[PDB]
Amino acid sequence: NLLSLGQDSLTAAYLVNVEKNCYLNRAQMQQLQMYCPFQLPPPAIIKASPSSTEPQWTGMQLFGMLFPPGFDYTYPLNNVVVSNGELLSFSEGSAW
Amino acid sequence: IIMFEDIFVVDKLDPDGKKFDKVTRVEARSHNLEMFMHLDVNTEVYPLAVGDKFTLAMAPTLNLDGTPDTLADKYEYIMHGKLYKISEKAELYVSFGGLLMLLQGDPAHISHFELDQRLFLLMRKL
Amino acid sequence: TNRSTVKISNVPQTIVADELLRFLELHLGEDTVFALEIPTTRDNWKPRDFARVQFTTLEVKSRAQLLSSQSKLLFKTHNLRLSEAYDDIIPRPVDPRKRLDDIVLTVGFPESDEKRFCALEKWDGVRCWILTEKRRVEFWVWESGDCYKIEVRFEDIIETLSCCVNGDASEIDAFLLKLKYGPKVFKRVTDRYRFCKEDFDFMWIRTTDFSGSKSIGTSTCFCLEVHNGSTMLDIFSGLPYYREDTLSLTYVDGKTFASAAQIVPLLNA
Amino acid sequence: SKLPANALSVNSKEGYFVKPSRTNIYNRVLSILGEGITVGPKRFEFLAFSASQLRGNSVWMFASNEKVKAEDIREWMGCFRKIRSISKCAARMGQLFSASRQTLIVRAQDVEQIPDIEVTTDGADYCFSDGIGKISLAFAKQVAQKCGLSHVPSAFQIRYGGYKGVIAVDRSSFRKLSLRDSMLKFDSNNRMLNVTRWTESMPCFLNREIICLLSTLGIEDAMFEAMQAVHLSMLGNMLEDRDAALNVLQKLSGENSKNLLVKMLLQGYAPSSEPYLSMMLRVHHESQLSELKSRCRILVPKGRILIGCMDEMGILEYGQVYVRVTLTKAELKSRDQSYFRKIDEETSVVIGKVVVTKNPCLHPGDIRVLDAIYEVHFEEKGYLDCIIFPQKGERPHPNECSGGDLDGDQFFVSWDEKIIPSEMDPPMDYAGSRPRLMDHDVTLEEIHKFFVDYMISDTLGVISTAHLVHADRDPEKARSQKCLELANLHSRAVDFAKTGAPAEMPYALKPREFPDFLERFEKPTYISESVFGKLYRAVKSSLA
Amino acid sequence: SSDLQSRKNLTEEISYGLREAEQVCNKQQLMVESWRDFLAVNGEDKEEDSVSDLARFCYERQKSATLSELAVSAFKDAYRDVQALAYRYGDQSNSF
**Strand partners for C225:** C104
Terminal C-alpha separation, chain B: 20
Q: For residue D516, give the DSSP letter.
A: S
Beta partners for C204? C188
CA distance B12 to chain C (A): 10
- The secondary structure of residue C267, as a DSSP letter, is P
Rounded Cα gap, residues D512 and C128, in angstroms: 33
* Interface test with chain C among B22, B24, B43, B50, by most C beta carbons within 10 Å: B50
CA B36 to CA B88: how far, in whole Å?
A: 14
Resolution of this entry, Å: 3.4
- Cβ of B23 within 8 Å of Cβ of A20? The answer is yes
CB C242 within 8 A of CB D62: no
Closest among D469, D509, D474 to D488, alpha carbons compared: D509
Query: Shortest CB distance from A20 goes to which of B45, B76, B98?
Result: B98
Q: Which of D7, D32, D37 minimises the CB distance to C206? A: D7
Give me the torsion for CA of D374, D378, D384, D388, rounded to 10°: -80
* Percent of chain D as helix, strand, coil, to the nearest 5: 30, 15, 55
- Tell me the C-alpha distance between D312 and D388, whole Å: 10
Residues of B whose CB is below 8 A from E92: 20-22
Q: In whole angstroms, what is the distance from residue D120 CA to residue C26 CA?
A: 79
Which of A21, A52, A60 has the CB atom closest to B97's CB atom?
A: A60
Contacts of D382 (CB under 8 A, 6+ apart): D154, D169, D171
Angle between helices D221-236 and D531-543 (to 10 degrees): 20
Separation of alpha carbons E58 and E38, rounded Å: 20
Please judge whether C42 and E10 are an interchain contact, meaning their C-beta atoms are less than 8 angstroms apart.
Answer: no
β-pairing verdict for B117-124 and B53-58: antiparallel
Task: Give the span between the Cα atoms of D497 and D495, in whole angstroms.
Answer: 5
| A48:B22 CB<8 A | no
Chain E CB contacts of D15 under 8 Å are 47-48, 50-51
Q: Is D86 exposed, middle or buried (0-12, 13-18, 19+ CB in 10 A)?
A: buried
- Smallest CA-to-CA distance from D366 within D209, D477, D258 is with D209
How far apart are the C-alpha atoms of A20 and A85, rounded to whole Å? 19
Q: At what angle do helices E66-83 and E4-28 cross, to 10 degrees?
A: 150
* H/E run at residue D263: helix D260-266
Residue spans of beta strands (DSSP E) within D455-538: none
Measured in angstroms, the CA of B15 and the nearest CA of chain C are apart by 8
CA distances from D167 to D119, D157, D377, D380, D407 (A): 21, 7, 20, 19, 9
DSSP per-residue letters across D394-420 = SS-HHHHTTS---SS--EEEE--S-S-
How close does chain D come to E3, measured CA to CA in Å? 37
CB-based contact D170:D323 (threshold 8 Å): no
Q: How far apart are the C-alpha atoms of D336 and D341, rounded to whole Å?
A: 8
Residues of chain A contacting B, Cβ within 8 Å: 17, 20-21, 41-50, 52, 57-61, 81, 83, 86-90
Q: Tell me, what amino acid is at C14?
A: T
CA dist., res. B42 & res. D96, Å (int): 80
Residue D254: partners with Cβ closer than 8 Å, 6 or more residues away: D202
Q: What is the dihedral of CA D212, D216, D222, D224, to 10 degrees?
A: -30
CA distance D521 to E64: 60
**Rounded CA separation D400/D420 (Å):** 19
Residues from D in contact with C at Cβ < 8 Å: 6-7, 10, 23-25, 28, 31-32, 35, 37-41
Nearest to D383 by CA among D306, D302, D328: D306
**Quick one: how many helices (H) and strands (E) in chain A?**
3, 3
In 3D space, the residue among C136, C150, C135 whose CA is nearest the CA of residue C105 turns out to be C150
Non-local CB neighbours of C50 within 8 Å, separated by 6+ positions? C7, C8, C9, C10, C11, C39
B23, A21 contact by CB (below 8 A): yes
Angle between helix E55-62 and E66-83 (nearest 10): 120
Terminal-residue alpha carbon distance, chain D: 34
Question: Are C205 and D10 within 8 A, CB to CB?
Answer: yes
* Residues in CB range of D463: below 8 A, 6 or more apart: D486, D489, D490, D493, D503, D505
Other beta carbons within 10 Å of C66: 11
Q: Report helix, strand or coil for E78.
A: helix
Q: Spell out the residues 6+ positions from residue E65 whose beta carbon is closer than 8 angstroms to its own.
A: none
| Calpha distance C80→B16 (Å, rounded) | 8
Chains with at least 3 CB pairs less than 8 angstroms from chain E: B, C, D
Q: How far apart are CA A22 and CA D217, in angstroms?
A: 60
B113 touches chain A (CB under 8 A): no
Q: Tell me, what amino acid is at D24?
A: N
| Interface contacts (A, B; CB < 8 Å) | 66
Give the span between the Cα atoms of D347 and D325, in whole angstroms.
6
Cβ atoms of C94 and C56 within 8 Å: the answer is: yes
Largest separation between any pair of C-alpha atoms in chain C: 76
Number of Cβ atoms within 10 Å of the Cβ of C141: 20
- After which residues does a break in chain D occur, C–N more than 2.5 Å? none
**Does chain C reach chain D with at least 3 CB pairs under 8 Å?**
yes
Measured in degrees and rounded to the nearest 5, phi and psi for residue D75 equal -80, -20
D17-35 CB burial, b ≥16 within 10 A, e <16:
eeeeeebbbbeebbeebee
Chain B contact partners (≥3 CB pairs within 8 A): A, C, E
Taking a C-beta distance cutoff of 8 angstroms, is the pair E21, E79 a contact?
Answer: yes
Q: Are A33 and A10 in contact (CB under 8 A)?
A: no
User: Residue type at A15?
Assistant: L
Residue in D54, D32, D7, D9 with CA at minimum distance from that of residue D500: D54
Residue B91, φ and ψ in degrees, nearest 5: -135, 155
β-sheet with C51-55: strand ranges across: C33-37, C51-55, C5-8, C82-84
Q: How far apart are CA C23 and CA C51, in angstroms?
A: 14
Q: Do E5 and C46 touch (CB under 8 A)?
A: no
Annotate D35-56 with three-state secondary structure.
HCECCCCCCEEECCCCHHHHHH
Best of B9, B12, B16 to disrupt the C interface (most C CBs within 10 Å) is B16
Q: Assess B81–A contact: CB distance below 8 Å, yes or no.
A: yes
Q: Which of D436, D384, D323 is nearest to D86 (CA)?
A: D436
* CA dihedral sign, ordered D210, D213, D215, D217: negative
Q: Which residues have C-beta within 8 Å of that of residue C193, sequence separation ≥ 6?
A: C16, C17, C37, C38, C40, C44, C47
Any CB–CB contact under 8 A between C10 and chain D? Answer: no
Alpha-carbon distances, residue C250 vs C165, C257, D132 (angstroms): 8, 18, 72
Contact B92, B103 (CB under 8 A): yes
As annotated, the binding site of D includes: 405, 407, 409
Give contacts of C263 with chain D, Cβ < 8 Å. 32, 37-39
DSSP D300-314: EEEEEEE-EEE-TT-
What distance, in Å, lies between the first and last C-alpha atoms of chain E?
13
- H/E stretch holding E4 reads helix E4-28
* C121 within 8 A of C215, measured Cβ to Cβ: yes
Q: What are phi and psi of C47, to 5 degrees?
A: -70, 160
Distance of CA C234 to the CA centre of its chain: 18
C-beta of residue C23 within 8 angstroms of C-beta of residue C75: yes
Cα end-to-end span (Å), chain C: 55
How would you write chain B as a 3-class SS string?
A: CCCEEEEEEEEEECCCCCCCCCCEEEEEEECCCCCEEEEEECCCCCCCCCCCEEEEEECCCCCCCCCCCCCCCCCCCCEEEEEEECCCCCEEEEECCCCEEEEECCCCCCCCCCCCEEEEEEEECC
Amino acid identity, residue D233? S
Residue D8 CB-density burial (10 A; 0-12 exposed, 13-18 middle, 19+ buried): buried
Asked if residue C43 lies in contact with residue E81, where contact means CB atoms within 8 angstroms, the answer is no
Q: Are B19 and B82 in contact (CB under 8 A)?
A: no
- Distance in angstroms (rounded) separating the CA atoms of residues B85 and B108: 17
The Cβ of residue D120 has, within 10 Å, a number of other Cβ atoms equal to 9
Specify the pairing of strand D320-321 against strand D369-372: parallel
Residue B53 forms contact with C (CB below 8 Å): no
Residues 6+ apart with CB under 8 A from D272: D278
Alpha helices in chain C (DSSP H): 17-27, 58-69, 232-236
Give first-to-last CA distance, chain A, whole Å.
13
User: Which chain E residues are closer than 8 Å to C13 by Cβ?
Assistant: 88-89
- Report the DSSP beta bridge partners of residue C150: C139, C185
How far, in Å, CA of D68 to CA of D71, rounded? 8
In angstroms, rounded to a whole number, what is the distance separating the alpha carbons of residues D336 and D342? Answer: 8
Alpha helix stretches (DSSP H) within E29-94: 36-39, 47-52, 55-62, 66-83, 86-89
